[PDB]
Design a protein around this nucleic acid. Sequence first.
RNA 1: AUGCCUGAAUAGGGUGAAGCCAGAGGAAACUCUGGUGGAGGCUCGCGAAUUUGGGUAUAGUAGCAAAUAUUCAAAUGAGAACUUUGAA
Length: 42
Amino acid sequence: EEEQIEKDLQGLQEKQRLNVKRERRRKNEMKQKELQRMQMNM
RNA sequence: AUGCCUGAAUAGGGUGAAGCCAGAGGAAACUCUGGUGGAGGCUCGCGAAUUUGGGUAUAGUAGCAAAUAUUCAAAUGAGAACUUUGAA
């Protein structure tokens, strides 16, 4: 009964941590990509 | 040997390069995983070679001339294996 609460709490916390790391990486990558595109047309 | 002008042709199978997308590891650089993409001195059926047209430069013996399967009936004709029609 409580095992389900513990399991989905831990799973969704892990999902949020992975999402935070992935979003940081994606934001850095997209920022660098658009800066390179801006400086590439010359 | 090296060319020039105007045309035809430069096919197919396999593999899967940069670049890109979504993920995981790392502070970056980067490295793996899946996809996408469709590139090449990649493969498959000092030397040699490097498709093609037109134009234009520097004893009646050997044997039967070799491309397989012919058959039946009728017509023509002096004469039909070889011509013609039908059937196989």
